[PDB]
Assembly symmetry: C4
Homo-oligomer: 475 residues x 4
């Protein structure tokens, strides 16, 4: 600490006094400032392209309910179920002929696929497919049942008529059926070339309609699910790259300011490699047992790891982004996360340069000194939260509605310790007030015991653990 002190003096300056103590320009700092205004614009200019490309996937699904399902209304997609025998027939037949008579009745200008896949042959594109147990004979009240699990794949195909059948001959064997599925495809031309302002892309759907019976109980859920798939196409349209060469040059400007940002922040951390061996030569281990590496973690540059973490995930989006043009990758998911997560790390990086004004120093530093004592209390409670979910996850599983699945129960109790959807979870049990009247006696004790523990006893400590950390640090 004779000559190390002035060498370590530069290692904990402010940004402001160091500029006057040495005289080197804050471009090493202010590149962080401009890349805020870079990447935020990069997100929103991605955001106009994404928000269009999902509504095209969305609206064509909403449309295909109102073409291929008899008597569909909006809203409930689960209550739509066929009960009678003939409504299973009529929903099938009303789904078949719309596929047959499509371009005379539809608006949207679609085209048939002429497939060759594995639930297809060559020539046909639609396929309805019965599924039932091969070897079996069941009867109640004179009880005998063979439930030999073996499908009977009766994929009775049908071709489309193109240009200006025996599916009527159909039986279903309702005592034995498992499910009836219907596969086909349609091609389309997406036509949302407003914000691109030029060349669009050319998409391909695949529609499944399922008359499922995994219940054998007299109710058949009727569903529609799609997947959209994308490829490229040949255009005669005119004057593409006008402002559209400018976005590509702009993404270079995006990848300009991040490129040198990786270099200097590593070079700033490279100084730590040059200082960590000098400290050990404090009179050539005259003490020696200072070294325990957690005190060296303060000697490690702290929040510089955050900026370099933001920077790697930043360039991983823009590299992935320019695959929108002529690469087979067009899944906008991984562009959304990587340009979504990296923007979250940029804005929190400015916090480090916010804590040098003294009335900003002493407030966020409370979160630094509390989080050791926070994490140690937190493991006491999180046993009990997890230990309390597994009771209601099967006990109040089917009887309730919002305690059905795996992760929704983990949402439901944690939503209930703040005060939203609390009374409705009380009220939904009371239709079972006499029906399974023992279980309502348990659920009423289940929710009364719970929030009396977390809200009225635990979270009061969770205030007083943070109130202390502000209290100790201001004196």
């Amino acid at each position: 600490e004779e000559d190390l002190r002035r060498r370590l003096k530069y290692f904990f300056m402010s940004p402001c006094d160091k500029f006057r103590a040495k005289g080197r320009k804050p471009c090493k700092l202010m590149l962080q400032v401009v890349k805020i205004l870079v990447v935020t614009v990069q997100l929103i200019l991605f955001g106009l392209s994404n928000q269009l490309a999902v509504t095209f996937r969305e609206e064509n699904t909403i449309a295909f309910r109102h073409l291929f399902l008899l008597g569909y209304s909006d809203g409930a997609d689960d209550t739509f179920a066929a009960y009678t025998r003939e409504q299973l027939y009529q929903a099938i037949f009303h789904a078949v002929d719309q596929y047959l008579a499509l371009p005379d009745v539809s608006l949207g200008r679609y085209a048939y696929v002429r497939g060759g896949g594995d639930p297809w042959t060559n020539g046909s594109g639609l396929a309805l497919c019965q599924r039932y147990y091969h070897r079996g004979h069941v009867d109640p009240a004179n009880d005998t049942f063979d439930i030999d699990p073996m499908v009977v794949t009766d994929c009775i195909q049908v071709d489309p008529p193109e240009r200006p059948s025996s599916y009527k001959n159909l039986t279903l064997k309702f005592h034995k059926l498992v499910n009836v599925t219907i596969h086909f495809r349609l091609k389309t031309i997406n036509l949302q070339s407003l914000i691109n302002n030029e060349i669009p892309d050319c998409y391909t759907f695949s529609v499944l309609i399922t008359f499922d019976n995994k219940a054998h109980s007299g109710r058949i859920p009727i569903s529609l699910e799609t997947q959209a798939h994308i490829q490229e196409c040949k255009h005669p349209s005119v004057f593409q790259h006008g402002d559209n060469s400018f976005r590509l040059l702009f993404d270079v400007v995006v990848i300009l300011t991040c490129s040198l940002s990786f270099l200097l922040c590593a070079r700033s951390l490279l100084r730590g490699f040059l200082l960590q061996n000098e400290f050990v030569g404090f009179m050539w281990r005259q003490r020696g047992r200072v070294i325990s590496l957690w005190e060296r973690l303060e000697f490690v540059n702290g929040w510089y790891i955050l900026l370099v973490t933001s920077d790697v995930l930043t360039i991983s989006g823009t590299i992935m982004k320019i695959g929108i043009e002529a690469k087979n990758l067009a899944s906008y998911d991984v562009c959304s996360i990587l340009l979504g997560t990296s923007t979250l790390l940029v804005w929190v990086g400015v916090i480090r340069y916010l804590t040098f004004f003294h009335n900003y120093n002493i407030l966020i530093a409370t979160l630094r000194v509390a989080l050791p004592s926070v994490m140690r209390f937190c493991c006491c409670v999180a046993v009990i939260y997890l230990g309390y979910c597994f009771c209601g996850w099967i006990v109040l599983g089917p009887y309730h509605v919002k305690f059905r699945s795996l992760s929704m129960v983990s949402e439901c109790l944690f939503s209930l310790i703040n005060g939203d959807d609390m009374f409705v979870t009380f009220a939904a049990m009371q239709a079972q007030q006499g029906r399974s009247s023992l279980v309502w006696l348990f659920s009423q004790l289940y929710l009364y015991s719970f929030i009396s523990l977390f809200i009225y006893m635990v979270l009061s400590l969770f205030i007083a653990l943070i109130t202390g950390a502000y209290d100790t640090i201001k004196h």
Copy 2:
């Protein structure tokens, strides 16, 4: 305390130092650790069987609305009410003929019951039953009314036609009717042998449809309620016990690790029987008046009573669980509570072994020293909560909706002191702004006075009583 001290020294060790001070293995401890991973799997492997067996009870009820009720739509089951004279007829007749013409129109493969019960004879299975006052003659505006309570059980039965009537002759006497009920049964074969992967069970319903009039006011609620009943049946199906003998052997492994857990925890408490008489021989009652038995309650092993409480309720489920196979008991309720409650006591048992790290010692111990002062404040408030329900329980009883029943009001105010369903309870009165305008003047003062008392005055003490207990114990 000469030789007692080292004998009592072992009585408040940590688990860790005792292993090195004597040298006996922590299998006495770690059986608690593995039975976490036992019973939690036992719950979820019960959970796949239960969640299927209620949806079969659920979906067949949802189906039987859409067969036996004219013009039923989903959602509201209470607003469905017949007002005219003939809609009482048409709903009956549309309920009758579906029972007659069932297997030609339904999917689900049911069978008739050919009953012999007390609202039955032998031969018929359906019975509609008028109910009215025997001796009476009423007339408004020339006022005379005999309301002699005496049923007229006119159970006009009807048989089913099985294999490839005068209920039309029916009058109801609408000025005198009480209610019209309809009883029948149906058998079924549950066919959810996916997760069993082999042999299913064979069920039996009983359906009641009630055209109730306990109002005599021109509206007839129409309802449907079932009960499911289970027995066994003879199977030709093949290769049952493949992985299904393995679950039975697994339940022995469940009842393995709990069996010895009862033994050793009692033996640990058996040491207390060997130490409680030695302490009294502290120089042969040289003091004597130490003994007041609450100080002996700390000398009582504290949380060991919790594990033995968890263990007895654990084996009471698995014994009850193996009655799924070939015992007449099949009510999954008491298996759900006992494998539900015992799992809640397991996870909280680990808390005891969590409080020996010193920053875990001093946080949950606050709840120990506060709960005396908590319980004493709590009896002051809970008089007022109960003393405030009984006002609104009949005053705002019929005028409101969510203040109707007994226990829902106890839910409603306690939901209202946190902040869910608060504004809607204000808003529902304002349709009675002129109609009974005095009562809305009371309800507006009812809810304004209330949360100004509990939220703004009482619960602030309920924070400051717990904040103190953290404050005193950290110095």
Copy 3:
């Protein structure tokens, strides 16, 4: 204070030590204990009678929508509005003939009224009544309009046919109409003699159906409102007073225990009349200027005024209650408040006898010493709450929905400072995002400024004002 001290010593005893210091029995106390178990049963035994007598008023209103309104469905009673010209006709005509053809089509056994009132004559019971401006002639785009306010009461009556017309000749003058109303009555026999178990009462409705146009804007709200009126009737039914003489004798037992309760509590306060003049003779005003009468308010018996307030309102219900039998009063409102409010004052009277255990003494007494400082802060805020309602009450009046009326806005902001119906009040403006786009710019600043003031700045003082009162009183 020589001989006054022992005389004032009895004036602040506990209840417990005074029983041993003098030896007089606690029947003076325990009558408060038993009247808890009296009046609470009196409320609930009133509650079975009230909850039936409103559902009869309720269900007959719900029924008369489904008879007299064309195409009514449940739920919305405001959106039901006739737009076309002929749907005003068809709803009238479908309301007329149901009144004509009632007993052949209805269940409920009603009877016609044969009225003689002021919008009636003798002979007819139904009356439809046009209302329009007498002297006027309006025309847009060649603009001239006389809006002389003068009704034209064209009450075209019609009689009913009783026992086994020219309303068709009707024009309405749609350019000039104000509203069309329809009056009639029906009698009934309430038949809910289950919990009385004997003699019922005989009721009378009056139904108004209004085709209002206070808008002249092309939409006519269609409404139905009733009033129920009660009188008595002659019965042939048998064995009335079996357990029904027992309730009358029970109400004497109710008015037994309250009667002497007024006497002794006044006599306890009568001691204060005997002590207030003795204190002034403290050495014959040797000081004199002690007397300022607020220190005498502690010398006033404090919570004894509460019991006597509960007692007067208690007997005012039971006196009012026995008018159910044979008095013209049958309005259950004032029985509901007076047996509702008096029960609230009984349970809070027990609190006084709860604060002598020392860990109960020092907790509710905080509310005593804080409420001076509470009320003084409270007048600072309640200016601002009232000063903030009047902005949104007309500015966000019609544009919103839940800021419409007078007192609902006073509900709405106070519901919004806790956290229910908060986001929906934000979201409802965004349909006016472009339509009146200036006003949404104001509402977004209206709700952002507000809860940032009360929740984040004011209510934090409202915790710290109560936390102090617990803090000062425990040292």
Copy 4:
């Protein structure tokens, strides 16, 4: 401070002692008191006129759905969309003929416009207008597409028949269409002369109905939007200004009490001009460096700037208000804000005269001394709030519903840090549990990380920063 002290002594008196130390009447004060009772009545007497004049704009929009849209029901205005080819036709044709056959079928007494505007000619008033790409030819699966953006304005007009066509010849070219719009107008006479009690105004609508397709995806949203426009008209009606000259004279009384209020409050601040130069002559800058102008901001009259701000905005409403009579301005928006904002500043002006009672002095002054330390903490958090919106604003943009637009996300998170609409935002993702299953893995971490930061860590400091300011100021 020799003679300045008594001169500055008057500068910080109370209002009460100054009245006795000099003897000048508090009319200088009490004009603030009466203008509370002035302007509040002025708001509400404006409020009766405004609340009528928007319902006339409201109800005629609600009516025109039920005339011009086939099969419209109430509630959802977005789900109403035509899917088939002919339902686009039938909704157009059912919109056309109602415009043709209006006065025989409607109630409301409208009149046609006989327009001459830019999407009009002279003679016709209705115009339907196709819009499609001029030069283009598209085809999927043999891919070629020309998307040359050029409208084809085929506004096929049509006249009305007035007094007692070839739009049938119509094709739409569905493969090429952009949108179909329909313009017309209607005049009306508002007839809500109840609270004016005399002369009404004469209005003019303009209705647009849009069959938009900015999607080209097989769904056409169908919408209706209006704008109301007002002018004046000639009346024969009688006895106008009875109480209506009295309101005009009352607005002078409103502008009376505000007029002198500007004068004296400025004159009170004019004293500051007479005192600010005297203080500098404190022994002719014997110190001099006191002067830093923030200490002079306390020497600036503080809350007097608030009253003069309220007063200027007060007269700007009433001047704007009397343009209701005979000026072309009739937009009630700017009267609503200026009579809405100025009332908010009046009631908060009374607060200054509330803080001289000593238990009122020391409570609101906490907000004065905290707000420096509040604002400095607040800029640390508001970076993170804004830095966290931009992630979810495009990532959870289309996948969610309530994260769609720009400013609703800013509402949504801030609604979520208090506890309303919290669980529903969790639950809406789980329909995408398998569909884009990666993104739900991100949203579940998005909302778990968030409120664990603001609610459980940040806002606890936000209590402890205000609790301190009450704590320091009371000692």
